[PDB]
Design a protein around this ligand. Structure first.
Ligand code: HEM
Ligand code: HEM
Ligand code: HEM
Ligand code: HEM
Ligand SMILES: Cc1cc(C)cc(NC(=O)Cc2ccc(OC(C)(C)C(=O)OCCO[N+](=O)[O-])cc2)c1
Ligand SMILES: Cc1cc(C)cc(NC(=O)Cc2ccc(OC(C)(C)C(=O)O)cc2)c1
Ligand SMILES: C[As](C)(=O)[O-]
Lengths: 145, 141, 145, 141
């Protein structure tokens, strides 16, 4: 799990994150880098090219919301399971989303944080963020059955 | 890459499977749904209860494709091209799931082939299933 | 996690298992099916062919040791972490074994139980055992650092 | 399969790395050791502390290998033939770890190339590293 110093490291970096942008950016790249994930967003429109995907308003809007839920989760690092319990049952029973996708979005998100913060996204900061995305992915997968 | 021994081994094994291939396909899927529930997200509207007709009908489909690959073991990328288009452009099942079905197919074969499921045959079958999987996800991006 | 029904199925099937035989058979198949795992047994001698591996006396002797510890873990299903704590530490600090190997051996063991029990290794019995081998692998990986 | 656009993207991004190759290689390794501790089991005889001369030196080795790959992206299997023999017969790193180093290489490149690390480039780089990884594990069994 996260050590006190890691939590601090996660919280201080996140406090400087524009969740709206990063979420649109992260969801966008997920769809460009792993194109098969577009299977869940057929009703979003043009996704024929990277630029279409990235500038697609429906992608940006959805990304904002997802990372918004992810962001709230960062405030309850000690109970990620309970926090995402509702979103978990939803993605399983209604959305039918294979949890592996949560892991792919996590790594894409780690890549975006690195792209945005540059040298500030140090090796120890990444390590702490790898724990978070894995924790959230496991939390979102917990209610599957 | 499948060696001359790998091919002899899988042809021998699958040949022994003979007319039960469809049945084994269905059993492998049932084992997969039970051992790895996340795989059920790809069959949201299927009746996945034990012995359901859809799962039996689907086991047949999976088995016929495997039978075809064994029949064309030296030209699988081409023999499985149509199925590979479907997987990459429509089904889009995440790659990790192919290892799950593969494992379950091994378990099923193991439970039905006491005589032929030797360590060598097991190695060959595992390579063969990994190779079929690779082809099926080779056009993902 | 295992349900009271699954714990019963696991224990019931395990009661008919010859631990020594299955141990040698499972480790042997690991080295045959995933040849690269041989990297940890360079002092065991001839591992050049399937029979050279499967009939290797030192491989057979080690299999006993491995499934023996696994067998004990099965008597402590509710505390695998603690049960494997010292072995976890050994495999990491002293043997330098990538934990991913424990997962491979797990699935090989599942194939071996299936090979031996035939139809008795029902889909539901397998599902219970996948949880067991996953829990054992996790327990052995827990003290890594 | 790496498309012409992928090869173009990869050559430009790695070209921008230039003299920093070894440095980024070392960083990618340090990132992986911290983020995924189990990878350290493959370097027991190494001083893995921050700034380690051994990791710096190792970063250069990995980077030079990749530079070779980039330049020979048309036929990596042969350009990396000796390296694939090494991993398959001596190093024998379990396949899962390659995805771990590739991710850390992506993170490293992202943190150093703000302008070049576009979505499309990100995608080509990821396919490229998955490809090198496939080649490096092609002779395992
Ligand atoms: C970081 C992890 C994720 C979080 C926290 C998350 C969160 C959310 C939230 C808050 C919603 C809205 C739920 C509602 O309408 O009440 C949602 C919807 C959805 N999510 Fe997730 N999600 C995550 C990852 C994913 C991934 C990786 C995919 C697929 C590649 C996915 C697919 C969907 C789909 C298809 C919808 C509904 C889209 C629509 O209504 O058009 N989610 N998610
Ligand atoms: C050895 C690997 C596999 C083979 C040979 C295989 C073969 C097949 C075949 C022949 C079809 C029928 C397509 C058609 O008739 O149009 C199919 C469909 C499908 N497969 Fe597989 N498959 C494999 C792995 C997987 C895995 C790993 C999953 C997911 C866990 C999966 C999920 C599906 C789904 C969702 C469909 C369509 C079902 C429907 O009709 O709604 N397949 N597969
Ligand atoms: C179910 C998981 C496993 C269990 C329960 C287990 C158990 C054991 C035990 C009790 C010992 C001897 C303790 C000692 O020497 O002090 C041992 C040694 C060792 N294990 Fe494991 N093990 C497992 C899986 C693995 C795997 C998959 C590998 C690697 C492919 C591995 C490699 C080794 C090695 C190299 C030794 C030392 C053998 C020697 O040279 O004496 N183990 N293990
Ligand atoms: C992009 C993927 C990779 C490339 C291009 C690569 C490249 C190299 C090169 C050039 C060498 C030096 C070989 C020589 O002396 O000629 C090497 C050695 C080695 N690699 Fe990697 N490697 C990759 C992935 C991995 C992974 C994933 C691991 C483990 C997590 C790993 C572990 C090792 C080890 C332990 C050695 C030998 C270290 C020593 O004792 O000197 N490599 N690699
Ligand atoms: C477990 C883990 C950890 C960490 C840090 C990261 C990832 N992430 C990934 O592995 C990302 C990925 C890439 C490709 C992929 O599958 C296809 C399209 C089918 C592919 O072509 O990859 C095979 C490439 O082999 N090749 O050259 O020929 C699935 C997932 C996974
Ligand atoms: C049930 C289950 C779940 C998971 C995650 C993995 C497996 N099994 C495997 O991945 C087995 C396997 C198959 C092939 C492997 O590597 C090589 C390099 C030979 C390959 O990719 O062809 C390495 C391991 C089974
Ligand atoms: C790894 As646990 C104690 O959350 O099941």
């Amino acid at each position: 799990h996260l050590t006190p110093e890691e939590k601090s490291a996660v919280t201080a970096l996140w406090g400087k994150v524009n969740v709206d942008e990063v979420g649109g950016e992260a969801l966008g790249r997920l769809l460009v880098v792993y194109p098969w994930t577009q299977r869940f967003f057929e009703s979003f429109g043009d996704l024929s090219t990277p630029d279409a995907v990235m500038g697609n308003p429906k992608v940006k809007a959805h990304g904002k919301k997802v990372l918004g839920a992810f962001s709230d989760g960062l405030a309850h690092l000690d109970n990620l399971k309970g926090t995402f319990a509702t979103l978990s049952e939803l993605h399983c029973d209604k959305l039918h989303v294979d949890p592996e996708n949560f892991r792919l979005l996590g790594n894409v998100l780690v890549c975006v944080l690195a792209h945005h913060f540059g040298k500030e996204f140090t090796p120890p900061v990444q390590a702490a963020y790898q724990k978070v995305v894995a924790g959230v992915a496991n939390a979102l997968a917990h209610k599957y059955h | 890459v499948l060696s001359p021994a790998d091919k002899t081994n899988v042809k021998a094994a699958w040949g022994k499977v003979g007319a039960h291939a469809g049945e084994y396909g269905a059993e492998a899927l049932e084992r997969m749904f039970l051992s790895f529930p996340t795989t059920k997200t790809y069959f949201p509207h299927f009746d996945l209860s034990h012995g359901s007709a859809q799962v039996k009908g689907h086991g047949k489909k999976v088995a016929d494709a495997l039978t075809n690959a064994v029949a064309h073991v030296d030209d699988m990328p081409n023999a499985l091209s149509a199925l590979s288009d479907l997987h990459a452009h429509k089904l889009r099942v995440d790659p990790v799931n192919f290892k799950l079905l593969s494992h379950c197919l091994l378990v099923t074969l193991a439970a039905h082939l006491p005589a032929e499921f030797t360590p060598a045959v097991h190695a060959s079958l595992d390579k063969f299933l990994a190779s079929v999987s690779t082809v099926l996800t080779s056009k993902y991006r």
